[PDB]
């Protein structure tokens, strides 16, 4: 019947059950256990799942247990300290979406401040990595998206335009999050938090109103809204020094 | 940069061969093969399409990519050792229908020993069990969690996320059906349009896709009905096709 309603107290009872099972199964190879996601922020809603992370002493440990009981869902990630720290210091195009997990850790088990170390590593990422990730996002994501809707304008399909518009607004949100080096609280609040940030690219907020409201059927408006956002991107990047290399026809 | 410019297939192929020559010049006999994938590999590139190319290296553990723009056009070249590429071609993730069409239409431009054919043969020869597992994982990892997200939206918001979530659910359903039929979608723009003409869809999916394809995503009440109907169709569909996971234990490890 899909996920059921659960209270915060029931989810924490489940968490401590998982904690005991982890400690029983892996014992002294467990360095730390934490809850992240909305339960880690103590903002989980009725239908929220449980996300837990485990620091293992075993070197090269990298596995996950993800399951449902038919009523609720749990995900537990098991990483060696090195693998977890290296992932926490790595900045992809979706870093604002993903790395909020290291800012929300509720420690449940910790033998030596490992969860604090993970948090310190995530909040201390060098500014250059956000610069590089922003330039990568423009090339690998926004430029490709611009080709996709320009193709749609000349040859369709307009049936893809609503989905693409959603993706573009999300990519724009990642761009803003990388620029402010702030992680969004949750996925559902990515767009609502993005448009309250300072320093938006021209045309971004207008595009987001289509995605947030769901009024994505006027495909001519959407293409014009995408173009204005794309135009504002070049002005915004030049104004913030996120300059993309266009000088080499073949850069290797 | 003025964004992507109009380019013809002839111009894009001229660019491909310039890249091939530079790859062959730089890596010499460590290049086992070079091929084109994406819409240019299918010779269906549109005016604003970019260029996607693959390269098989003999160097062990080679795994890098060069992706760049000139301000007018964009290129991506992926370099993989044969082993890494054959391994990647034979793993089935939740997004296999989105990603692995690349191995079925490679336009060959350089090949020292049928490596491009070997990649294709590897991609088509994946065991049925790998699709079964990917489908069961997808239900747990993606659909069940999406169901909680829209149920959370109904009770505590935000509805401003609902159009986006609905797009994501339609895409995941498209992966689900593509995994079921072992069909890879052509390009991202055709994922939903091809998913809905597949036989034996879960009940409520085509209606959900009609919301997403038409862009009529402002009626939060109707979307929530539609997501629930599709979620119901999933329970019927998986359970009728044997995509069953044991869910009886509170902690299954
Ligand atoms: N190449 C074979 C294998 O690919 C894997 O990565 C796969 C996937 O992650 C990766 O996706 C990469 C991302 O990462 C990176 N952040 C930007 C890049 N444009 C995107 O590329 C892919 O998605 C784009 C659509 N948005 C497509 O336009 C593009 O043609 C496609 N190669 O491309 C690969 C599939 O083509 C691993 N590298 C490795 O297991 C092995 O190399
Ligand atoms: N965990 C530390 C690091 O995680 C990485 O993977 C990251 C990412 O791909 C991975 O994503 C995994 C997927 O893969 C897997 N196929 C389904 C699973 N629901 C999803 O989980 C992630 O996405 C969900 C939202 N859709 C979130 O609810 C979930 O909490 C989040 N961990 O979770 C990790 C981030 O939390 C690498 N494994 C490795 O660098 C190292 O293990
Ligand atoms: N695609 C993704 N990949 C990796 N991490 C992600 C992710 N999406 C979200 N996250 C990270 O993983 C955490 C848990 O994500 P989710 O379970 O999907 C939503 P949540 O933040 O717990 O709020 P919720 O109550 O709506 O569930 C996020 O808070 C975020 O830090
Ligand atoms: N998110 C993704 N990740 C990995 N591969 C993807 C992908 N999306 C699409 N693909 C694969 O990579 C190839 C190239 O994708 P893209 O360049 O993004 C669109 P295309 O198929 O070339 O048509 P188009 O560029 O004319 O719109 C696709 O044909 C497809 O097999
Ligand atoms: Ca969660
Ligand atoms: Ca989760
Ligand atoms: Ca392409
Ligand atoms: Ca591409």
XYZ file of C-alpha atoms and ligand atoms in Angstrom:
655
model
C 0.000 0.000 0.000
C 3.072 2.237 -0.381
C 4.716 4.187 2.429
C 2.621 4.605 5.565
C 2.363 7.447 8.054
C 5.021 7.232 10.755
C 5.905 9.550 13.580
C 9.384 10.825 14.367
C 9.504 8.657 17.497
C 8.727 5.469 15.524
C 11.421 6.315 12.962
C 13.996 6.801 15.745
C 12.975 3.501 17.326
C 13.637 1.936 13.908
C 16.952 3.771 13.744
C 18.171 2.365 17.033
C 17.079 -1.097 15.935
C 19.239 -0.682 12.859
C 22.068 0.685 15.008
C 22.036 -2.402 17.209
C 21.918 -4.725 14.215
C 24.897 -2.953 12.626
C 26.957 -3.115 15.793
C 26.058 -6.787 16.317
C 26.903 -7.692 12.733
C 30.087 -5.656 12.162
C 31.242 -4.985 15.749
C 34.551 -3.185 16.112
C 34.752 -2.416 12.418
C 32.063 0.223 13.003
C 33.664 3.586 13.682
C 30.475 5.680 13.661
C 26.770 5.677 12.811
C 24.625 8.678 11.995
C 21.240 9.651 10.672
C 21.077 12.171 7.864
C 18.323 13.489 5.623
C 15.200 15.011 7.160
C 15.241 12.674 10.136
C 18.755 13.911 10.842
C 17.381 17.477 10.826
C 14.410 16.478 12.989
C 12.151 17.719 10.134
C 10.929 14.380 8.768
C 7.310 14.350 7.667
C 4.692 11.615 7.958
C 5.845 9.742 4.845
C 9.589 10.378 5.107
C 12.059 7.498 4.833
C 15.180 6.852 6.935
C 18.700 7.602 5.715
C 21.676 6.403 7.761
C 25.423 6.460 7.217
C 28.091 4.200 8.707
C 31.834 4.828 8.936
C 33.736 1.522 8.840
C 37.352 0.869 9.759
C 37.567 -1.681 6.957
C 39.626 -0.128 4.190
C 37.924 0.169 0.784
C 34.519 -0.519 2.373
C 31.753 0.772 0.085
C 28.338 -0.843 0.276
C 24.715 -0.015 1.023
C 21.616 -1.767 2.309
C 18.434 -0.252 0.918
C 15.071 -1.831 1.530
C 11.412 -1.375 2.308
C 9.164 -3.254 4.659
C 6.293 -2.411 2.353
C 5.381 0.338 4.836
C 8.617 2.296 5.275
C 11.969 2.508 3.527
C 15.524 2.555 4.882
C 18.889 3.189 3.295
C 22.174 2.564 5.075
C 25.508 3.496 3.515
C 28.716 1.877 4.722
C 31.973 3.628 3.783
C 35.546 3.586 4.999
C 36.579 6.926 6.458
C 38.760 7.679 3.436
C 36.067 6.899 0.849
C 33.506 8.908 2.805
C 35.846 11.867 3.312
C 36.917 11.929 -0.333
C 33.272 11.897 -1.479
C 32.439 14.729 0.980
C 35.188 16.917 -0.506
C 34.179 16.318 -4.090
C 31.975 18.871 -5.881
C 29.773 17.641 -8.713
C 27.099 19.558 -10.639
C 24.522 18.335 -8.130
C 26.555 19.111 -4.972
C 23.867 21.564 -3.672
C 21.330 18.737 -3.894
C 23.464 15.931 -2.487
C 25.902 17.244 0.040
C 23.312 18.595 2.447
C 23.595 15.155 4.003
C 26.884 16.106 5.670
C 25.314 19.214 7.236
C 22.457 17.267 8.852
C 24.160 14.350 10.642
C 22.503 13.258 13.866
C 25.176 11.083 15.529
C 23.918 7.812 16.996
C 27.245 6.078 17.502
C 30.703 7.602 17.340
C 33.958 6.214 18.672
C 36.252 9.112 17.848
C 34.565 12.194 16.435
C 34.356 10.654 12.960
C 31.006 12.298 12.117
C 32.360 15.684 13.207
C 35.375 15.090 10.977
C 33.067 14.305 8.055
C 31.117 17.496 8.706
C 34.291 19.595 8.951
C 35.538 18.137 5.668
C 32.275 18.883 3.890
C 32.083 22.480 5.116
C 35.763 23.198 4.334
C 35.765 22.348 0.620
C 38.065 24.662 -1.302
C 36.354 27.485 -3.156
C 38.102 26.543 -6.414
C 36.142 23.280 -6.577
C 32.877 25.237 -6.702
C 34.336 27.417 -9.459
C 35.335 24.382 -11.515
C 31.973 22.675 -10.936
C 30.103 25.771 -12.091
C 32.087 25.911 -15.326
C 31.578 22.189 -15.824
C 27.820 22.617 -15.214
C 27.523 25.283 -17.933
C 29.322 23.163 -20.523
C 28.114 19.693 -19.639
C 24.545 20.610 -18.675
C 23.270 24.108 -19.584
C 24.841 24.302 -23.050
C 23.512 20.851 -23.852
C 20.076 21.815 -22.588
C 20.174 24.934 -24.784
C 20.854 22.738 -27.801
C 17.941 20.532 -26.799
C 15.318 23.262 -26.660
C 16.699 24.985 -29.768
C 16.283 21.670 -31.555
C 12.758 21.450 -30.163
C 11.960 24.912 -31.550
C 12.935 23.873 -35.086
C 11.976 20.182 -35.128
C 10.170 19.247 -31.882
C 9.149 17.457 -29.890
C 7.329 19.995 -27.743
C 6.231 17.030 -25.603
C 9.720 17.073 -24.132
C 9.671 20.795 -23.388
C 7.965 20.524 -19.947
C 10.477 17.898 -18.746
C 13.446 19.834 -20.126
C 12.191 23.038 -18.502
C 12.133 21.231 -15.162
C 15.681 20.002 -15.682
C 16.930 23.451 -16.669
C 15.382 25.099 -13.612
C 17.014 22.447 -11.427
C 20.375 22.938 -13.136
C 19.986 26.674 -12.613
C 19.333 25.966 -8.947
C 22.498 23.901 -8.732
C 24.381 26.819 -10.327
C 23.085 29.209 -7.688
C 23.844 26.716 -4.914
C 27.391 26.160 -6.163
C 27.904 29.940 -6.354
C 26.748 30.507 -2.736
C 28.422 27.235 -1.642
C 25.199 26.405 0.212
C 23.407 23.073 0.086
C 19.663 23.078 -0.278
C 17.738 21.761 2.728
C 15.781 19.086 0.829
C 14.951 18.232 -2.757
C 11.377 19.544 -2.473
C 12.636 22.986 -1.408
C 15.398 23.283 -4.044
C 13.475 25.682 -6.313
C 11.735 27.620 -3.528
C 15.098 28.240 -1.829
C 16.875 28.984 -5.117
C 14.631 31.922 -6.000
C 15.110 33.517 -2.563
C 18.882 33.570 -3.032
C 20.654 36.776 -3.909
C 22.345 37.237 -7.235
C 20.087 35.235 -9.531
C 20.902 34.943 -13.219
C 18.648 37.135 -15.301
C 15.492 35.252 -16.302
C 15.930 32.470 -13.758
C 13.067 33.402 -11.433
C 10.635 33.832 -14.339
C 11.523 30.351 -15.592
C 11.082 28.880 -12.116
C 7.550 30.213 -11.839
C 6.580 27.938 -14.723
C 8.107 24.905 -13.019
C 6.826 25.705 -9.525
C 3.320 26.488 -10.721
C 3.154 23.642 -13.245
C 2.022 25.958 -16.070
C 4.210 24.210 -18.626
C 1.796 23.877 -21.544
C 2.604 27.183 -23.336
C 5.643 25.931 -25.150
C 6.352 29.243 -26.976
C 6.567 31.074 -23.603
C 8.768 28.365 -22.267
C 11.210 28.557 -25.169
C 11.396 32.311 -24.791
C 11.795 31.923 -21.026
C 14.615 29.402 -21.591
C 16.367 31.745 -24.044
C 16.221 34.685 -21.642
C 17.646 32.493 -18.894
C 20.366 31.241 -21.212
C 21.200 34.827 -22.187
C 21.315 35.901 -18.549
C 23.725 33.014 -17.867
C 26.488 34.519 -19.990
C 26.081 37.877 -18.270
C 25.941 36.223 -14.843
C 29.065 34.084 -15.375
C 31.047 37.039 -16.676
C 29.913 39.070 -13.705
C 31.008 36.354 -11.266
C 34.197 35.265 -13.018
C 32.970 31.778 -13.951
C 34.564 32.069 -17.373
C 34.437 28.985 -19.610
C 37.323 28.084 -21.921
C 36.195 28.313 -25.555
C 39.605 28.873 -27.151
C 40.596 25.321 -28.202
C 38.783 23.476 -30.976
C 40.367 20.291 -29.582
C 41.662 20.794 -26.018
C 43.773 17.646 -25.889
C 29.258 32.543 -26.291
C 25.955 32.765 -28.202
C 24.845 29.243 -27.242
C 24.730 26.289 -29.642
C 24.677 27.331 -33.305
C 23.085 25.553 -36.262
C 25.383 22.915 -37.717
C 24.940 20.397 -40.470
C 25.710 16.714 -40.270
C 28.571 17.335 -42.727
C 30.180 19.934 -40.421
C 29.802 17.652 -37.392
C 31.501 14.779 -39.243
C 34.345 17.063 -40.269
C 34.794 17.825 -36.572
C 34.709 14.108 -35.699
C 37.557 13.261 -38.031
C 39.680 16.130 -36.736
C 39.157 14.686 -33.243
C 39.954 11.167 -34.461
C 43.226 12.318 -35.971
C 44.245 14.105 -32.777
C 43.345 11.023 -30.707
C 45.350 8.771 -32.993
C 48.258 11.241 -33.022
C 48.303 11.645 -29.235
C 47.791 8.028 -28.140
C 48.991 6.100 -31.199
C 48.813 2.340 -30.675
C 47.070 2.732 -27.316
C 43.900 3.555 -29.307
C 42.000 0.353 -29.944
C 38.880 1.966 -31.365
C 37.048 5.233 -31.929
C 33.326 5.438 -32.575
C 30.534 7.998 -32.590
C 27.395 7.548 -30.568
C 24.436 9.768 -29.803
C 22.307 11.285 -32.519
C 25.325 11.829 -34.771
C 26.094 8.109 -34.539
C 22.519 7.459 -35.678
C 22.834 10.101 -38.399
C 19.704 11.734 -36.914
C 21.420 14.758 -35.407
C 19.324 17.892 -35.477
C 20.621 21.365 -36.299
C 21.593 22.097 -32.680
C 22.858 18.623 -31.716
C 26.248 18.200 -30.067
C 28.854 15.497 -30.786
C 29.286 12.400 -28.587
C 32.291 10.140 -29.182
C 33.797 7.057 -27.532
C 37.321 5.662 -27.561
C 38.580 2.253 -26.436
C 42.108 2.367 -25.018
C 44.527 -0.494 -24.502
C 45.898 1.309 -21.427
C 44.624 -0.532 -18.359
C 42.430 1.462 -15.964
C 42.088 4.283 -18.469
C 38.872 6.091 -17.564
C 38.692 9.732 -18.550
C 36.602 12.082 -20.601
C 37.183 15.337 -22.469
C 34.080 17.483 -22.643
C 34.309 21.039 -23.913
C 32.652 23.770 -25.925
C 33.972 26.235 -28.480
C 31.080 28.536 -27.593
C 29.317 27.456 -30.811
C 29.350 23.670 -30.506
C 30.020 21.135 -27.789
C 31.904 17.830 -27.869
C 32.262 14.960 -25.438
C 34.881 12.226 -25.871
C 34.936 9.314 -23.414
C 38.056 7.162 -23.162
C 37.753 3.726 -21.560
C 39.938 0.684 -21.487
C 38.279 -2.280 -23.137
C 37.681 -4.010 -19.800
C 36.102 -0.986 -18.095
C 33.885 -0.312 -21.125
C 32.781 -3.929 -21.519
C 32.021 -4.076 -17.809
C 30.008 -0.842 -18.004
C 28.144 -2.137 -21.051
C 27.089 -5.257 -19.114
C 25.792 -3.625 -15.883
C 22.120 -2.694 -15.688
C 21.372 0.332 -13.499
C 17.943 1.930 -13.044
C 18.755 4.264 -15.948
C 19.935 1.543 -18.352
C 17.153 2.406 -20.866
C 18.394 5.983 -20.807
C 22.122 5.293 -21.140
C 22.875 2.036 -22.913
C 21.369 2.815 -26.310
C 24.796 4.272 -26.968
C 26.222 0.789 -27.528
C 23.644 -0.218 -30.187
C 24.239 2.432 -32.878
C 27.973 3.224 -32.713
C 29.182 4.784 -35.955
C 32.665 3.244 -36.395
C 35.501 5.491 -37.514
C 38.569 3.558 -36.235
C 38.774 -0.029 -34.960
C 41.945 -2.122 -34.769
C 40.291 -5.419 -33.851
C 36.494 -5.429 -33.797
C 36.357 -3.795 -30.370
C 33.249 -1.803 -31.294
C 31.494 -4.975 -32.344
C 32.571 -6.629 -29.077
C 31.016 -3.778 -27.077
C 27.762 -4.118 -28.994
C 27.724 -7.883 -28.520
C 28.389 -7.380 -24.812
C 25.545 -4.841 -24.520
C 22.987 -7.091 -26.195
C 23.984 -10.246 -24.288
C 23.155 -9.115 -20.730
C 21.470 -11.906 -18.751
C 17.748 -11.618 -18.006
C 18.451 -11.663 -14.270
C 20.310 -8.347 -14.399
C 17.175 -6.655 -15.704
C 15.060 -8.394 -13.070
C 17.287 -7.113 -10.260
C 17.421 -3.603 -11.724
C 13.632 -3.489 -11.899
C 13.258 -4.619 -8.279
C 15.908 -2.135 -7.143
C 14.202 0.650 -9.091
C 10.899 0.047 -7.272
C 12.597 0.262 -3.863
C 15.194 2.916 -4.563
C 13.089 5.226 -6.708
C 9.348 4.603 -7.019
C 8.636 3.799 -3.362
C 10.570 6.867 -2.290
C 8.802 9.081 -4.839
C 5.501 7.818 -3.445
C 6.500 9.051 0.022
C 7.540 12.418 -1.412
C 4.198 13.136 -3.051
C 2.317 11.766 -0.059
C 4.355 14.164 2.054
C 3.462 16.941 -0.380
C -0.263 16.213 -0.030
C -0.115 16.518 3.767
C 2.533 19.195 4.353
C 3.603 20.551 0.941
C 5.220 21.979 -0.959
C 3.006 21.725 -4.036
C 5.598 23.835 -5.844
C 7.705 20.671 -6.036
C 4.888 18.533 -7.431
C 5.305 19.311 -11.168
C 9.011 18.443 -10.906
C 8.370 15.284 -8.914
C 5.742 14.242 -11.412
C 8.258 14.625 -14.218
C 10.729 12.484 -12.262
C 8.140 9.787 -11.653
C 7.223 9.644 -15.340
C 10.901 9.235 -16.198
C 11.358 6.495 -13.635
C 8.288 4.699 -14.975
C 9.859 4.995 -18.402
C 12.993 3.323 -17.068
C 10.827 0.635 -15.502
C 9.127 -0.243 -18.786
C 12.342 0.056 -20.754
C 14.026 -2.381 -18.391
C 11.063 -4.702 -18.695
C 11.204 -4.717 -22.505
C 15.007 -4.461 -22.610
C 14.572 -1.462 -24.853
C 16.847 1.547 -24.750
C 15.300 4.913 -25.543
C 16.776 6.775 -28.522
C 17.407 10.157 -26.895
C 16.148 11.968 -23.824
C 13.468 13.842 -25.765
C 11.887 10.562 -26.935
C 11.958 8.708 -23.588
C 8.345 9.359 -22.643
C 7.021 9.266 -26.195
C 8.589 5.836 -26.727
C 7.808 4.552 -23.232
C 4.080 5.065 -23.738
C 3.887 2.986 -26.915
C 5.455 -0.020 -25.213
C 3.081 -2.868 -24.538
C 1.889 -3.826 -21.080
C 2.360 -0.549 -19.257
C 1.469 -0.363 -15.571
C -2.051 0.922 -15.127
C -2.169 4.741 -14.862
C 1.234 5.420 -16.463
C 0.075 6.665 -19.875
C -2.330 9.029 -18.171
C 0.497 10.303 -15.967
C 2.716 10.849 -18.999
C -0.039 12.843 -20.680
C 0.179 15.346 -17.842
C 3.967 15.562 -18.243
C 4.066 15.628 -22.034
C 1.323 18.260 -22.316
C 2.816 20.424 -19.604
C -0.529 20.561 -17.804
C 0.998 20.185 -14.340
C -0.769 22.952 -12.364
C -3.718 20.912 -10.999
C -2.159 19.527 -7.861
C -5.223 17.473 -6.983
C -5.326 15.755 -10.384
C -1.586 15.013 -10.329
C -1.839 13.444 -6.880
C -4.725 11.244 -8.075
C -2.655 10.300 -11.092
C 0.492 9.509 -9.145
C -1.512 7.302 -6.781
C -3.213 5.519 -9.715
C 0.190 4.864 -11.291
C 1.524 3.725 -7.904
C -1.421 1.313 -7.745
C -0.686 0.163 -11.277
C 2.900 -0.523 -10.210
C 1.767 -2.821 -7.389
C -0.416 -4.727 -9.828
C 2.212 -4.771 -12.599
C 5.288 -5.829 -10.606
C 3.367 -8.427 -8.755
C 1.918 -9.894 -11.969
C 5.372 -10.039 -13.581
C 7.154 -11.442 -10.552
C 9.142 -8.320 -9.711
C 8.750 -9.239 -6.070
C 11.133 -8.481 -3.269
C 10.788 -10.107 0.119
C 9.718 -7.192 2.337
C 8.809 -9.208 5.462
C 11.811 -8.401 7.694
C 12.235 -5.060 9.428
C 16.022 -5.324 8.891
C 17.056 -7.648 6.030
C 20.778 -7.947 6.783
N 31.936 5.683 -20.745
C 31.630 4.377 -20.163
C 31.264 4.443 -18.794
O 30.485 5.753 -18.524
C 30.232 6.064 -17.105
O 29.621 7.341 -17.044
C 28.451 7.390 -17.698
C 27.729 8.583 -17.081
O 28.157 8.625 -15.669
C 28.275 9.626 -17.717
O 27.458 10.728 -17.724
C 28.240 11.904 -17.873
C 28.406 12.612 -16.512
O 29.194 11.812 -15.663
C 29.120 13.978 -16.596
N 28.814 14.724 -15.363
C 28.715 14.833 -17.808
C 28.482 14.024 -19.099
N 27.932 14.894 -20.147
C 27.574 12.804 -18.911
O 27.564 12.124 -20.171
C 26.366 11.446 -20.580
O 25.112 12.148 -20.234
C 24.753 13.350 -21.088
C 23.377 13.662 -20.841
N 23.323 14.457 -19.587
C 24.938 12.962 -22.566
O 24.744 14.130 -23.353
C 26.283 12.386 -22.815
O 26.375 12.050 -24.251
C 26.474 11.178 -22.032
N 27.882 10.611 -22.249
O 28.519 9.132 -19.256
C 28.638 7.834 -19.222
C 27.633 7.160 -20.193
O 27.951 7.549 -21.540
C 31.494 6.033 -16.291
N 32.436 7.169 -16.709
C 32.250 4.771 -16.456
O 31.529 3.660 -15.817
C 32.524 4.421 -17.885
O 33.435 5.376 -18.420
N 27.999 7.272 0.555
C 29.266 7.961 0.317
C 29.495 8.012 -1.069
O 28.141 7.800 -1.785
C 28.255 7.777 -3.260
O 26.976 7.587 -3.861
C 26.094 8.588 -3.703
C 24.914 8.411 -4.676
O 25.351 7.848 -5.971
C 24.149 7.501 -4.070
O 22.871 7.580 -4.536
C 22.172 6.371 -4.241
C 22.096 5.521 -5.525
O 23.392 5.225 -6.013
C 21.330 4.209 -5.287
N 21.214 3.556 -6.579
C 19.915 4.474 -4.762
C 19.966 5.382 -3.517
N 18.598 5.744 -3.132
C 20.752 6.677 -3.738
O 20.774 7.337 -2.474
C 20.884 8.745 -2.579
O 19.774 9.241 -3.405
C 18.386 9.289 -2.763
C 17.565 10.204 -3.498
N 17.510 9.641 -4.867
C 18.525 9.747 -1.296
O 17.287 9.481 -0.673
C 19.572 8.936 -0.647
O 19.575 9.188 0.796
C 20.858 9.261 -1.202
N 21.924 8.491 -0.413
O 24.195 7.884 -2.479
C 25.349 8.480 -2.291
C 25.176 9.902 -1.722
O 24.542 9.839 -0.450
C 29.196 6.686 -3.686
N 28.579 5.322 -3.355
C 30.503 6.738 -3.001
O 31.219 7.933 -3.453
C 30.387 6.827 -1.522
O 29.756 5.629 -1.073
N 19.907 12.429 -5.727
C 20.609 12.473 -4.452
N 21.802 11.872 -4.416
C 22.513 11.863 -3.245
N 22.016 12.466 -2.132
C 20.815 13.068 -2.206
C 20.100 13.071 -3.343
N 18.929 13.717 -3.174
C 18.915 14.123 -1.894
N 20.075 13.728 -1.319
C 20.751 13.758 -0.067
O 20.382 12.729 0.663
C 19.489 13.213 1.788
C 18.332 12.415 1.976
O 17.561 12.584 0.806
P 15.983 12.130 0.640
O 15.658 10.913 1.493
O 15.773 11.719 -0.796
C 14.875 13.599 0.992
P 15.059 14.281 2.725
O 16.114 15.354 2.808
O 15.333 13.205 3.751
O 13.644 15.045 3.087
P 12.249 14.172 3.105
O 11.666 14.168 4.489
O 11.310 14.713 2.048
O 12.571 12.733 2.813
C 19.124 14.676 1.251
O 18.646 15.501 2.398
C 20.174 15.096 0.706
O 21.203 15.494 1.667
N 21.746 11.000 -18.846
C 22.461 10.183 -19.817
N 23.522 9.532 -19.338
C 24.270 8.732 -20.169
N 23.933 8.610 -21.477
C 22.851 9.280 -21.939
C 22.108 10.059 -21.134
N 21.090 10.617 -21.826
C 21.193 10.167 -23.095
N 22.276 9.352 -23.142
C 23.026 8.556 -24.066
O 24.055 9.227 -24.578
C 23.722 9.539 -26.007
C 23.875 10.905 -26.259
O 22.972 11.657 -25.474
P 22.653 13.255 -25.776
O 23.832 13.836 -26.517
O 22.369 13.965 -24.466
C 21.072 13.394 -26.748
P 21.255 12.564 -28.408
O 20.942 11.090 -28.292
O 22.624 12.738 -28.991
O 20.182 13.346 -29.361
P 20.356 14.968 -29.544
O 21.741 15.382 -29.076
O 20.283 15.284 -31.009
O 19.280 15.652 -28.710
C 22.186 9.079 -26.142
O 21.922 8.646 -27.539
C 21.988 8.173 -25.292
O 22.247 6.775 -25.691
Ca 14.956 10.860 3.673
Ca 16.116 8.563 1.081
Ca 24.201 14.402 -28.706
Ca 25.797 15.004 -25.341
